[PDB]
């Protein structure tokens, strides 16, 4: 699992579950192209999004949808989605945890990135 | 003075001084066309991006050149911006301030939204 | 004005206003003795709290009283306050901004020390 | 497990490793007595701090020596220490993991809480 998705509600103390996550590689052309989604789970975690194989150098979007989370919950919040964008692989291959803590107008992410 | 954004350097403790920023504004074929730019000053912020009377509701895009001023000081990133993507909607009087905090690979963005 | 709080809140997006601060500089006994205290204005923002000739070398520690604070919004908190610790340096002339972002099971804190 | 403490390193974009952590709690005469200490594996975890027998009510006190871990990699940072305090088990015994996020001037903390 060379890509997962970790998300937490800074309201409740607990993990953002149900957050769908959209991830987007730009192609050659400069496109950001559909690479992989999912939704995060009840630990709030998104596993198994890419393979090894797939997941090649590139420039990737991990579009995480917190508008949708908090309007689930009846809460109106600031931003549209959390974008998080980043080069992969340059060095060779890299496992990447994405983290991000939401509040409805406030989130922070993270990388925590291992060989 | 509708808009503004204010950076902050958790590494140095410093406000992020010289960091590029643009604003792009949703246009109507979902495509982001450009609104506004500029640079933070020694204070770490920037105004005057845009007037009362450009800065009507839509979705608007904030994109911060984190990697370029972490390059600068000669320190590797992780992100290549920070994005920031929110709906302005008119309610009363509103002074949005997009706030960021950055490290090398973290940061974090607040909305203060005043009257 | 070397020494300034500023306070946040991530929740509505807004400044976090009339949360009380205490600040204690810690004594030749490793106890903590009360230095300053007041609470945050409209602005979230504490002034005045200490001069350039009181403000000597130590160890402070702020404590921002964020249970009180969630507690008159009526929301349900996990820290009983933030507290703040760090040793003030005379390394040429400084000011010290101690700002933190508040959530009810999250909070950060920041220190922009400039010149 | 009921009380676990996880923490990451902004700068590195790692866990950060070896940090020492030590517990209190308030005792009946409102000191502060050592409840439990550790350090953080090579995953930025400590487990084993206590057990539910032995994390009854009260209020503790986490606080995370942020200042030795920073020094040891040849940084001088901002704060002494990131400290948590809350109140646990106030409702029934709770799992608790406290997360802190640390940058040489800023840090975070979040709690996640489970039942
Ligand atoms: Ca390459
Ligand atoms: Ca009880």
Same mark, same amino acid.
Request: with cysteine; charged share 20%; aromatic share 10%.
């Given at each position: 699992?060379?890509?997962?998705? +970790?998300?937490?509600?800074?309201?409740?103390?607990? &993990?953002?579950?149900?957050?769908?996550?959209?991830?987007?590689?730009?192609?050659?052309?400069?496109?950001?192209?559909?690479?992989?989604?999912? +939704?995060?789970?009840?630990?709030?975690?998104?596993?198994?999004?890419?393979?090894?194989?797939?997941?090649?150098?590139?420039?990737? +979007?991990?579009?995480?949808?917190?508008?949708?989370?908090? +309007?689930?919950?009846?809460?109106?919040?600031?931003?549209?989605?959390?974008?998080?964008?980043?080069?992969?692989?340059?060095?060779?291959?890299?496992?990447?945890?994405?983290?991000?803590?939401?509040? &409805?107008?406030?989130?922070?992410?993270?990388?925590?990135?291992?060989?």
């Amino acid at each position: 699992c060379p890509l997962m998705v +970790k998300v937490l509600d800074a309201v409740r103390g607990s &993990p953002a579950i149900n957050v769908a996550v959209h991830v987007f590689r730009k192609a050659a052309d400069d496109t950001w192209e559909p690479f992989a989604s999912g +939704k995060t789970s009840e630990s709030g975690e998104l596993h198994g999004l890419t393979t090894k194989e797939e997941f090649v150098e590139g420039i990737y +979007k991990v579009e995480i949808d917190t508008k949708s989370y908090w +309007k689930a919950l009846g809460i109106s919040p600031f931003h549209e989605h959390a974008e998080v964008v980043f080069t992969a692989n340059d060095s060779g291959p890299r496992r990447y945890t994405i983290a991000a803590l939401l509040s &409805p107008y406030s989130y922070s992410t993270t990388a925590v990135v291992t060989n």
